[PDB]
Amino acid sequence: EFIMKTRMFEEEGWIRKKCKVCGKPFWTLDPDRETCGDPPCDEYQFIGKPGIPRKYTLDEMREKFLRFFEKHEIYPHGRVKRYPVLPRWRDDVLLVGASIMDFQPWVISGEADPPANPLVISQPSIRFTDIDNVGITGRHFTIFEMMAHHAFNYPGKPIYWMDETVELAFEFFTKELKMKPEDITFKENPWAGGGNAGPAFEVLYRGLEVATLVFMQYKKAPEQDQVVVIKGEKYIPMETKVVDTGYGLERLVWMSQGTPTAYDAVLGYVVEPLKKMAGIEKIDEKILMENSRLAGMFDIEDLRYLREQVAKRVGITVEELEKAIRPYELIYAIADHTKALTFMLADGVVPSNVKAGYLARLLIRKSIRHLRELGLEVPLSEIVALHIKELHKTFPEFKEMEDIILEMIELEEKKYAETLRRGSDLVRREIAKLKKKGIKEIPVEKLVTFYESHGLTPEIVKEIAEKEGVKVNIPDNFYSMVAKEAERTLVDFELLKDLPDTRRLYYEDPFMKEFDAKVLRVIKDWVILDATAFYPEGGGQPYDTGVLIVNGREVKVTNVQKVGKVIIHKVEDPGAFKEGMIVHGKIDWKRRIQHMRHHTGTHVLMGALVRVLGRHVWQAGSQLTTDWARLDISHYKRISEEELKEIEMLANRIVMEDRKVTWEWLPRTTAEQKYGFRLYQGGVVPGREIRVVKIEDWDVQACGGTHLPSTGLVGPIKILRTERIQDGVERIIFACGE
Ligand SMILES: C[C@H](N)C(=O)NS(=O)(=O)OC[C@H]1O[C@@H](n2cnc3c(N)ncnc32)[C@H](O)[C@@H]1O
Ligand SMILES: [Zn+2]
Ligand SMILES: [Zn+2]
C-alpha cells in the first residue's frame, strides 16, 4: 500500500524486486539476488563464517551502537537510560516488547516531551510470541536488547525521516561493523505494535534479520473510514511522524561470532557451565552443523517435519537426532528464560496468576521442568545468580534487588514442588474420569485448563495420561498460546462535550468547604456547575457529599462523579435547579476531613511499606472510607506480624515528625525525571500535566485526591490487619486519626 523510495535507493542504484519465493518487495544492491533475504527464502550463511570482520561482545557492540549515534557528525542523538520492562507508564501492554513502547502513548501523542530528539537507547525487550522458538531456531530469545534511534517529528518541526534513517542505519552496518554492502537487503513489511503502525523495512543480512525500521504515522481506530488495515487491525493517520528503529543486539553479536546459536555467543556464562553439570557430550559435528544451518528455516504457528527433514538430511532417525540436540534445546531455554526472569523480577514483577506475574511464574515452571528433563537438581536461583554475577556490572539494579530476586525464586520453586504433587494426583484422577467417558487423546483446550488451574506443563500431563493409555499430544506452539491467556477485557454521557471544564476548587484550597457557582445544566438528577468544592469519586477516595442551597432551600448532594473534565452532582431535587441559576454549596466537612486523613495516611504508609518490605512494593489497589482505609500492595510472601508492627511503628514516627505534604503540577516527563516511575502507583493519569503529591523525603506520587498540609494532622495510625487477597497481592487495613 505504501511507497518506500528512499534517496539512498535512488542515488546508489538499488533495485526493488518481488522475492521469487514470497513475492514481497525488497531492495537489493545485487542484480542477481532473486529472493528477499529472509528464511525460509534464504538459509543461515554465517555459521563458522562470521559476517562481521572482528568479534564483538554484548558490551562492546552495545557501546559501539550507542556511541555511534550519540556522537554522529550530522545528526547527534541524545542517549536515554533504559526503561523498566514492567510498563509503569501505561495500562495496555503487560511487558515492554519493542523500545518504542517506552514512548507510547504520551510521547507519541505530544502530550509528553521526549527525553531527547533524536534519541538512542538499548532497550530490554520481552516477547512470549516466540517462547516456543527459543532453543530451537537459534535466533529467538525471550529477552533481548532492542537498540534503537528514535526521532519524533511533530508538525512544522522535523528531526529526520525515512531518507536519513535508511542511511544512519546503512552507515553503521558498513562503516562501523564493516558488513558486505551487497549482502544487506531491505525487505518491505508494515509493522504494527502497541497502538501504532506504519510501513517498515526489515534489514536482512546473510540470512538473518538484524534490524527493523518503522516509519510510524498511524494510530488505532476508534469505533470513520479514512482507515487503513496494517495487520488485521484498523488505523487512521496521525499528526506525529515517528522513527521507530529496532536493532537486534544479540543478533549482531551472533553475526560477529559465527557460533552455532546466538545463545552460545551471548549466554556462554550459563550454557557451558550447565553442559558440564548435565555431563552432556559435545555433539557430532556433521550433525551439529547440518542442524545449526537448517534451524532458521522453521518457526511455529509442525516442528515434527523439520525434524524428519534434518534427520533424512544428516542421515539418521528422528530419535537418533532428537537424542542429540534435545539436551541443547533445554539448556538454551533455561539460560534464556532465567535471564528474562532476572530482568522481570528486578523490575518489580511479582510472580502470580495474572498479567506480568502469570508470565514470570510460567517462565519459572518451564525452566524447572527443563532442569528436571536434563536430570539436573541445581536450584533455579543458582542459575539466576550467574545472570546477576555477570550483568550487575552493566545493570547495577541486579545487585540491589538481588535478595528479593533470589528469595522470590526460592519460594516459587518450593511452591512448585507441592503444586506438582497435588496437581499430578488431581489431573490423573480427572483423566481416569475421561478414559471411561470415551476419550483416547486429550484435546488442546483441556491441556490449557490443566495449566491454568493446576499448574502443570503438558510434559507432565502427557506421561500421567500415558501411564493410563491416553495420548502424548503437545502442540509445538503450546507455551506461546498459553502466554496469550494473561489478561481480560456507565452513569452519564453525550451532552457534556459542549460544556466547559469544571473548576476544581478543592485543588486550589482543600480546606475550602463553602462556595458559589452557576448551574450550567441539569441532565436527569445530575447537576452540572462551573466551579465546585465537591470532590468527585476517584483515587480510592470516595465522593464528597453536602448541600446545594438554592432559592433558600437545602438540597442534598448524594453523589459526585466526574465524566471527562465535567463533574456531575446527584441531588435529591432535579426540579429545583435551572440552567443559569446561582447556588451556594456546602461540603459535608466531617466526612471530608476524615477522608483526607485516610488518604495522606495511605501515602505515609506506602512510604513505610517500601522501606521495610523493599522496592518491589507497588500499589495494587486502594479503598478508603471515613473509618478505615485499605491498601493492597504487590508482595510475594506474607507480611509477618513482627513486620506489620515495624511498618506501623515507622508510619507513626512520621506522623509524629509532622513532615510537609506538598503538591504541584508538573509536565509528565519532568516529573518522571525528577522522581522516576514511582509516581505511577495507583493508576496512570492522562494529560500534559500531572499532580504530584509528595511527603517530605518519604513518598511521592502522581495522585489527584485531596490531602493535608502536614502529617501531624493524620493522627495515630492503627494497622488493624493484613490479609492475602490473591497470589502476589497482600492487603493492609488501617484507620487513622484520634
Ligand atoms: C522496530 C520495531 N518496533 C520492532 O521492534 N521490530 S521487530 O519486531 O522486528 O524487532 C526489531 C529487531 O529486534 C530483534 N528481535 C525481534 N525478536 C527477537 C527475538 N525473539 N529474539 C531476539 N531478537 C529479536 C530482531 O533483530 C529484530 O530485527
Ligand atoms: Zn522472500
Ligand atoms: Zn493518593
UniProtKB/Swiss-Prot annotation:
Enzyme class: ligase
Catalytic activity: tRNA(Ala) + L-alanine + ATP = L-alanyl-tRNA(Ala) + AMP + diphosphate
Entry's Gene Ontology molecular function annotations: alanine-tRNA ligase activity; aminoacyl-tRNA deacylase activity; ATP binding; tRNA binding; zinc ion binding
Any single biological process term in GO: alanyl-tRNA aminoacylation
Binding site for Zn(2+): H599, H603, C703
EC number annotated for this UniProt entry: 6.1.1.7
Compartments where located: Cytoplasm
GO CC terms, sorted: cytoplasm
Swiss-Prot/TrEMBL cofactor(s): Zn(2+)
Keywords annotated in UniProt: Aminoacyl-tRNA synthetase, ATP-binding, Cytoplasm, Ligase, Metal-binding, Nucleotide-binding, Protein biosynthesis, RNA-binding, tRNA-binding, Zinc
Cofactor descriptive note: Binds 1 zinc ion per subunit.
Free-text domain note: Consists of three domains; the N-terminal catalytic domain, the editing domain and the C-terminal C-Ala domain. The editing domain removes incorrectly charged amino acids, while the C-Ala domain, along with tRNA(Ala), serves as a bridge to cooperatively bring together the editing and aminoacylation centers thus stimulating deacylation of misacylated tRNAs.
Function: Catalyzes the attachment of alanine to tRNA(Ala) in a two-step reaction: alanine is first activated by ATP to form Ala-AMP and then transferred to the acceptor end of tRNA(Ala). Edits incorrectly charged Ser-tRNA(Ala). Incorrectly charged amino acids occur because the of inherent physicochemical limitations on discrimination between closely related amino acids (Gly and Ser) in the charging step.
Similarity section: Belongs to the class-II aminoacyl-tRNA synthetase family.
Assembly with partners or alone: Homodimer.
Protein name from the UniProt record: Alanine--tRNA ligase
Organism the protein comes from: Pyrococcus horikoshii (strain ATCC 700860 / DSM 12428 / JCM 9974 / NBRC 100139 / OT-3)
Lineage: Archaea, Methanobacteriati, Methanobacteriota, Thermococci, Thermococcales
Parent-protein residues present: 2 to 752 of 915
